[PDB]
Write a protein that binds this ligand. Sequence first.
Ligand SMILES: Nc1ncnc2c1ncn2[C@@H]1O[C@H](COP(=O)(O)OP(=O)(O)O)[C@@H](O)[C@H]1O
Lengths: 214, 90
Amino acid sequence: ETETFAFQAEINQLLSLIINTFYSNKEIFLRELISNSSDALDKIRFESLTDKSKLDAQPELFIHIIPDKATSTLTIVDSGIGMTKSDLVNNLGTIARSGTKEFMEALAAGADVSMIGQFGVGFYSAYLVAERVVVTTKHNDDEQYVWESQAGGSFTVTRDTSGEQLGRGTKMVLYLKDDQMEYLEERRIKDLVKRHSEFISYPISLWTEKTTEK
Amino acid sequence: KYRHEYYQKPEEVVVTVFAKGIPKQNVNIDFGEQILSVVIEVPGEDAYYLQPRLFGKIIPDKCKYEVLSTKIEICLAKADIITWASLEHG
Ligand SMILES: Nc1ncnc2c1ncn2[C@@H]1O[C@H](COP(=O)(O)OP(=O)(O)O)[C@@H](O)[C@H]1O
């Protein structure tokens, strides 16, 4: 087909705080995404120590960052373990982990939005800089699906047909807000990566033409 | 066996059984006020059983399921609009 779910209470509130307050440290979104994406690679790797055939669908473990100046989208893709549809509905909005409420309390008590990661809701940091996010994922156990939301209190999961099929993993596309146009520049991205990913152990490449960095 | 998961909306609970290429014919699923029974038939050995006593109660006539090639989706219709804390009930 597509199915529609409404964000759990807590998460709606958080999504509001994120997309409606002006925060300073918006740049950590790329950290949180690159991370959540490392964590995903780790999983498919461990699953593969005892089953070499796990990565058959797509054998290289990687992270690609693809800034399209034209459509004004920063997009991140990994060959991580990916999400089943069930996983999409459960992690990206339907279940509200404990840190969600905890985080907002902390926020108002004057914590910094950069802690959004340490509280277990890192994913939504994307809406700091994006107005629409479109996650498309394929997990070994299920087919490719697409999660999409504009933070308007609900999200959609849809089976992927028209799309170009990933072997395995996840392709987050961030349709960037106006002011946030800076995360499309090659220099900026290269900075941000170096600055926060000095513990993450897979090839991160920048397809604003070609190559990989540090 | 075969892996299972579930997610929930305020009105339904959706149990997925990850079973590749199961013939529509081999899946036998029945519903009860507070039970679910999934029995997909495996040709070689014993059947797969997923036969929990459900957390909440459900409306068995409103329950549907769908065999899909990667998975079998089962939409359980919650009898009461109340969030379940697990598929099963211990
Ligand atoms: N790129 C990705 N690949 C696979 N799974 C992901 C990805 N991004 C997010 N997820 C899923 O979203 C869940 C929560 O993400 P996040 O909000 O960062 O919290 P945390 O980083 O603490 O898990 C994870 O448990 C993971 O399964």
